Structure formats: C-alpha cells, structure tokens
C-alpha cells in the first residue's frame, strides 16, 4: 500500500476512519491539535470502496486516548490491521472492523499519542504511533 | 502480588529474570544505566521459589532493546505473564517461559526502555515500561 506519515503534533481532536465488518480497516484520517489549532491531517484512503465511515470526535483537551488496541490478521492473503479500538478517559470507541487474528494493545499510563504513520493498500497494512508527554 | 516501580533511568545494562516451563515468569531484576554507571535495580522476587534464572547481559551502550513481547495466560487460577522475549538491535533473548495464552508485544521505532514497573506474586502479574529519548 501507500506509506503515510502525518508527523507529530500537540494532541488529537478527531479520528475519521472506515472499516468493513467482514474484512479490515480501510480509510484513516486524523484531525490533530497543533498548538491549539485544529490540524487537518491528509485523508489516507484505501485503494477500494465499500467501507463504513465513523467519526470519533473527541472533547479535546479534557478527553484523550488511553489505549489503542485491535487485531492484525489475514485478508486476501495480506497481514493487515483488522480492527481498532480507541479507549479514552471518557469512553470506548469501537471495535471497528473484525475482532479476529492476533490481539495487540498499547495502554498508556503517562503521556499522549501525538501522531500516526503506517501504510494503507486495500486495507490498513500496519501503523505506528508518535508518543509525547 | 507485591507492586513494584523501579522508576526511570538512563538505559538498561542487564536483565535478570527467572522462569519455569510448567508455569510462568517468576523473578525480575534490572541492572540500569544511570548517567553512564551501572545501578543495580531492586530484585523483585516471587512469593515462591524453584525457578530457573537467566541473565541477559547487553553490550551497553551499543546494544538496546527494540521489542518486548510475550504471552499472558492462566496458571493455577492466576492470570500472569507466562513468557517474555527481548529483542535487541543485536539478538533475540528468549522466549523464556510457556508461549501459550494471549500474545502481547511492544515494538519500538524510536526511543528507549528506561524503566520497569509492575506486580509480582507467585508469578509476574503485569508490567509497564518507562520510555524516553
């Protein structure tokens, strides 16, 4: 798929993703914070259509992500990110996608996710997270 | 378990843990770096004994941990870390323990493990890691 790297920012305002309840995560886009202004990150699009969009509008700055978790697994013979779950100090959003394959989770006791990078082809292939205090 | 918290240091020189094939991870002790000097961490020991010790001696400073992984599962009613694996830029150490249960992994693109906290009872219940540039 096509690599992206949004970089690091100050915080997260909103996450906009798409998913299919029989396959994987599709589209992925983030509205970050940047020193108090919304920073509209680029829309990282799946090569294919048929996904269901969801808007995770966080109550920034009092609301912030405490755990990202999900599953990785095979779809059409690629290892992809099959489901995501975003738990903040205020509520849980997801799982979105298919909760099958290998679990993974990044709980955070201290600090903030401030950035995403990764790769999207037909589905979200892999991703990483920038962390900061 | 008895909760522990080493806090944050400059880097890791050495890991001493113990495990039992039948059960899970027992003891855990880290020799940290502190401003270019070894600092021997508190030895966090199981309520019970009978484990097989190992020592993971890193070539500090040029060797560092890039990924921690393992498995959690239920041993005699206790949900615990049943194995651990430590991958550096140089080699993989482990797996130590039973590699059955739910997987976990923390991989690192940028930055260092500088600290460990958690809880040890009969086995290692859980742990967290301090991360720094």
């Amino acid at each position: 798929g096509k690599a992206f790297d949004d970089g690091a920012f100050t915080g997260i305002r909103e996450i906009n993703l798409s998913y299919n309840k029989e396959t994987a995560i599709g589209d992925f886009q983030v509205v970050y914070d940047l020193n108090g202004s919304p920073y509209v990150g680029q829309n990282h699009k799946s090569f294919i259509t048929g996904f269901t969009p969801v808007k995770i509008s966080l109550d920034f700055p009092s609301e912030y992500i405490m755990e990202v978790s999900g599953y990785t697994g095979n779809v059409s013979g690629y290892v992809v990110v099959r489901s995501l779950t975003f738990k903040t100090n205020k509520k849980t959003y997801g799982p979105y996608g298919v909760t099958s394959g290998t679990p993974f989770n990044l709980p955070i006791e201290n600090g903030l996710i401030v950035g995403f990078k990764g790769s999207i082809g037909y589905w979200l292939d892999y991703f990483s997270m920038y962390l900061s205090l | 378990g008895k909760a522990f918290d080493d806090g944050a240091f400059t880097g890791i020189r050495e890991i001493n843990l113990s495990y039992n094939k039948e059960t899970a991870i027992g003891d855990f002790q880290v020799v940290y770096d502190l401003n270019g000097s070894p600092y021997v961490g508190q030895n966090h020991k199981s309520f019970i004994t009978g484990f097989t010790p190992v020592k993971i001696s890193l070539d500090f400073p040029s060797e560092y941990i890039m990924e921690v992984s393992g498995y959690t599962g239920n041993v005699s009613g206790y949900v615990v870390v049943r194995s651990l694996t430590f991958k550096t830029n140089k080699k993989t150490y482990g797996p130590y323990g039973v590699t059955s249960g739910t997987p976990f992994n923390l991989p690192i693109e940028n930055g260092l493990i500088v600290g460990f906290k958690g809880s040890i009872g009969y086995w290692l219940d859980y742990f967290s890691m301090y991360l720094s540039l």
Partner: peptide
Amino acid sequence: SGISQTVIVGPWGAK
C-alpha cells in the same frame, strides 16, 4: 541535527 525527535512505538500489522 535541527530536526526535533519523538518516541515512536510500533508498527503493528504487516512486517
């Protein structure tokens, strides 16, 4: 360098 650095954890998914 004059490029600021950040902790990055990951990736999860395809190797």
